[PDB]
Design a binder for this molecule. Structure first.
Ligand SMILES: Nc1ccc2oc(=O)ccc2c1
Length: 126
């Protein structure tokens, strides 16, 4: 069902939460070799999450589930704000700019926490 597909998407989202918090700790500790690996793992995860979200949105559209489509349009747009901040973060790591890395990391956390009520609303609407 589209609902069970969203729960699978929700799990991938929580995996990225776990890998992110770990990567944050590594960054604070200066373990750049770990950070690089966690950033690669996160990029794969966000690619998977985005795709599951697009398939869910497309299915809700084909189903005519107007409320779920509205919420998923809002949620995917925000997802892309998270994705842009993540990519800037990756560039800051490449460039050795720890000040920008810290900034983007905090921003990504705040964009994510904000989008959490909407994430739960989607589960109920699908
Ligand atoms: N909430 C959130 C946080 C980080 C993210 O990074 C990405 O690369 C794509 C989406 C995304 C969403």
């Amino acid at each position: 069902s589209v609902k069970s597909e969203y729960a699978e998407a929700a799990a991938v989202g929580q995996e990225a939460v776990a890998v992110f918090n770990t990567m944050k700790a590594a960054f604070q500790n200066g373990d750049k070799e770990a950070v690089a690996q966690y950033l690669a793992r996160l990029a794969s995860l966000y690619t998977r999450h985005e795709e599951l979200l697009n398939r869910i949105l497309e299915k809700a559209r084909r189903e005519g589930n107007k409320e779920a489509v509205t919420l998923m349009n809002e949620f995917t747009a925000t997802f892309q704000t998270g994705k842009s901040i993540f990519n800037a973060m990756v560039a800051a790591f490449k460039n050795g700019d720890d000040d920008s890395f810290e900034s983007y990391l905090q921003a990504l956390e705040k964009v994510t926490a904000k989008g959490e009520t909407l994430a739960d609303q989607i589960a109920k609407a699908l």
